[PDB]
Design a protein around this ligand. Structure first.
Ligand SMILES: Cc1nc2c(F)cc(-c3nc(N[C@@H]4CCN(S(C)(=O)=O)C[C@H]4O)ncc3F)cc2n1C(C)C
Length: 332
């Protein structure tokens, strides 16, 4: 059974696109996500079908049309169906950081630090890119970090919670997946910045080192109790910057004995109560935890070369251009 639609490439000029072998792979309040095979190339795609009101633009679509980056899933096409549905057609990526982490956790093992470095570095590159446009993802979690098993390339997906943040325009605070939710959001802040994604990235890093979520809250409010158990009660000034008294647990005692000190140091500079005290994504990319990735002899565990990690555009470096001397090593 072949379906033929008139799709606009993600130059607004539609073309006929045919696909087959459709199967449901995902769900949500937005609608359904399918996997399908394009007829000409045989390439696999993910098709996200969203119920769309004909009165007003789709925010996810407008954000996806502006993105062109190696570490973000590419919007190949979009089309309409049926009650109108918007359908986003993206290149299919079979694995995720969530599935990889779960496999290690069930086998009582930790993910090799080379993979933690490769995944986190590519996530920080995708965030430096989207943040350079004022766009905040607002749902950074391991389930939205797609991985190519053979190349170790990471791609950020699901821009359904994303938003261009404009100063003076309030934003919803009950946002982000709970375990990865920044403390200013739990305090009800509506004037938050892109640094909420950096808190989420720090939660993903800590989870990859620990083998389980660092802050496993059982409700939106208990999420703050879980955070407090580790970072201690925030001071009055920390609370002001964001929007059961306990002393902070020492960072070295949070992680396992053989955890690299550079991973702990990076984690401590991401999981800060004060949003402005957190590293920006470009600064996180320049951290000494990623030094091994800038070694000219670095290879993936399967013997292949690592993905292209140094092809930074001017747009990616725009927040701090002098960081290119650390980010692009002389051999590249
Ligand atoms: C809510 C949402 N919006 C999405 C979107 F815009 C694109 C994609 C997407 N997904 C994939 N692959 C995923 C590999 C993992 N599997 S699983 C958990 O093993 O069944 C789900 C599958 O959707 N590939 C490309 C995409 F753009 C996935 C999306 N999702 C969920 C399913 C993560």
């Amino acid at each position: 059974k072949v379906t033929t639609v008139v799709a606009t490439p993600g130059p607004d000029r539609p073309q006929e696109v045919s696909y087959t072998d459709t199967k449901v792979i995902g769900n949500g309040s937005f609608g359904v996500v399918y996997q399908a095979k394009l007829c000409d190339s045989g390439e696999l795609v993910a098709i996200k079908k969203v119920l769309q009101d004909k009165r007003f633009k789709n925010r996810e679509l407008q954000i996806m049309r502006k993105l062109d980056h190696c570490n973000i899933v590419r919007l190949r096409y979009f089309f309409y169906s049926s009650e109108v549905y918007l359908n986003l057609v993206l290149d299919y990526v079979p694995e995720t950081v969530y599935r990889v982490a779960r496999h290690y956790s069930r086998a009582k093992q930790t993910l090799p630090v080379i993979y933690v470095k490769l995944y986190m570095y590519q996530l920080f590159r995708s965030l430096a890119y989207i943040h350079s446009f004022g766009i905040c993802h607002r749902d950074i979690k391991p389930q939205n970090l797609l991985l190519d098993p053979d190349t170790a390339v990471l791609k950020l997906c699901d821009f359904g919670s994303a938003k261009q943040l404009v100063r003076g325009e309030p934003n919803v605070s009950y946002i982000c997946s709970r375990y990865y939710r920044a403390p200013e959001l739990i305090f009800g802040a509506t004037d938050y910045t892109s640094s909420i994604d950096v808190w989420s990235a720090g939660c993903v890093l800590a989870e990859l080192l620990l083998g389980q979520p660092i802050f496993p809250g059982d409700s939106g409010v208990d999420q703050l109790v879980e955070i407090i158990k580790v970072l201690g009660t925030p001071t009055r000034e920390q609370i002001r910057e964001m929007n059961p008294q306990i002393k902070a647990h020492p960072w070295t005692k949070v992680f396992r004995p053989r955890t690299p000190p550079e991973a702990i140091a990076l984690c401590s500079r991401l999981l800060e109560y004060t949003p402005t005290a957190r590293l920006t994504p470009l600064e996180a990319c320049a951290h000494s935890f990623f030094d091994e990735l800038r070694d000219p002899n670095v290879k993936l565990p399967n013997g292949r070369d690592t993905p292209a990690l140094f092809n930074f555009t001017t747009q990616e470096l725009s927040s701090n251009p002098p960081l290119a001397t650390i980010l692009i090593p002389p051999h590249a």
